[PDB]
Amino acid sequence: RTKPFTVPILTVEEMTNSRFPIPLEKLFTGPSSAFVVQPQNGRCTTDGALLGTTQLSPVDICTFRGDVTHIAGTQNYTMNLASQNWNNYDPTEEIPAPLGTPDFVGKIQGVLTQTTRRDGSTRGHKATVSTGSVHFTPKLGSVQFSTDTSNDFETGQNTRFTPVGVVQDGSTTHQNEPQQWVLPDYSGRDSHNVHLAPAVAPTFPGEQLLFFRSTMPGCSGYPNMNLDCLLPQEWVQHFYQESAPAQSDVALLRFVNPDTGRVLFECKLHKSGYVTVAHTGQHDLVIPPNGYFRFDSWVNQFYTLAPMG
């Protein structure tokens, strides 16, 4: 027969958020018709086709590389993006934006570091990329950082953004940003995103998406730190390696507790890459820290999940 499908045998705490480089913490479900679940990172079919902007490196998510150019009389820099290899980025390539680009609207704070090539001297500065900005145009090849210096970065020098966490302005409404479910305009104002991974939704009565959730570090104020992915990064990696052909619509997984030996809940892993459970309402799953998912079988869409207690 065909190569058997599997998911990694890893606990939730053992795995990594696929939308920002931090560990998963906890599983969450809620209704999703009041927002658009259409993230671009962490997108992979069960048989291993990466969609959207999703790539394999769990550390390259939300990072940026290239050379900078100071913007006269401000503390801001434009970065001309390079690819991961440091090869020039191609804006004609059939993707929404550079792989790893952030897929939520918000202000990401991190550190911009630079090596001068002629002598190996080295600098680093606190820097913020605002993905909702008029100047956030990764698909065009340019992005802009606000920083705390006006003189120190040099032109024509390898520069890198390391993301750290998220920010919101305290004088406004608490948790008003980031908005994890609003994609940026990858090409700036008045232009359409292209080649997106499909939006997703539960398509069976009584079902909701299962999200794998982390808390982003916050750098200032009160910023909404929940960040939900559709697949752990290790799943993307796993599926990409294994490339097992989907035998039917849904892969039925059981979440098991090894201590009791008991099945805790069952979920559907849709072929095109997300998870749904049977439940109505918002719910932080309570799980044994060493519980894990295991694959049971390929079933039809119309298979009825036992309610998640």
Ligand X SMILES: CC(=O)N[C@H]1[C@H](O[C@H]2[C@@H](O)[C@@H](CO)O[C@@H](O[C@H]3[C@H](O)[C@@H](O)[C@H](O)O[C@@H]3CO)[C@@H]2O)O[C@H](CO)[C@@H](O)[C@@H]1O[C@@H]1O[C@H](CO)[C@H](O)[C@H](O)[C@H]1O[C@@H]1O[C@@H](C)[C@@H](O)[C@@H](O)[C@@H]1O
* Single-letter code of the amino acid located at 12: V
Query: Phi, psi (5° rounding) for residue 266?
Result: -125, 150
Q: Would you say 104 and 179 are in contact if contact means Cβ atoms under 8 Å apart?
A: yes
Interface with a copy of itself (CB under 8 A), residue from 13, 35, 245, 289: 35
Helix (H) or strand (E) run with residue 70 in it: strand 64-70
- Asked if 195 interacts with ligand X (CB under 6 A), we say no
β partners of residue 268 = 252, 276
Closest CA to 110 of 83, 142, 79: 79
Interface with ligand X (CB under 6 A), residue from 85, 171, 203, 300: 171
Q: How many Å apart are CA 207 and CA 288, to the nearest integer? A: 23
Task: State which of positions 281-300 bind a copy of itself (CB under 8 A).
Answer: none
Which of a copy of itself, ligand X, none is residue 220 near (CB under 5 to 8 Å by kind)?
ligand X
* Single-letter code of the amino acid located at 139: K
- Asked if 42 interacts with a copy of itself (CB under 8 A), we say no
* 103 annotated to bind ligand: no
Which of ligand X, a copy of itself, none is residue 152 near (CB under 5 to 8 Å by kind)?
ligand X
* Single-letter code of the amino acid located at 6: T
- Asked if 50 interacts with a copy of itself (CB under 8 A), we say no
Stretch that binds ligand X, among 2-10, 55-63, 115-123, 283-291 (CB under 6 A): 115-123
- Asked if 201 interacts with a copy of itself (CB under 8 A), we say yes
Stretch that binds a copy of itself, among 53-61, 133-141, 169-177, 213-221 (CB under 8 A): 169-177
Stretch that binds a copy of itself, among 21-29, 94-102, 191-199, 286-294 (CB under 8 A): 191-199
Query: Phi, psi (5° rounding) for residue 131?
Result: -80, -5
- Asked if 72 interacts with a copy of itself (CB under 8 A), we say no
Both structure tokens of 82 = 């390079």
Instruction: Kindly determine how many residues on this chain lie close enough to bind a copy of itself according to the rule CB under 8 A.
Output: 23
Both structure tokens of 249 = 């619509």
Could you count the other beta carbons within 10 Å of the beta carbon of residue 157?
Answer: 16
User: For ligand X, which residue has the nearest CB?
Assistant: 170
Which residue, chain included where needed, has tokens 């001068």? 116
Per CB under 6 A, residues contacting ligand X are 121-123, 152, 170-171, 220-222
Residues in the annotated binding site for Zn(2+): 70, 117, 119, 125, 148, 154, 238, 242
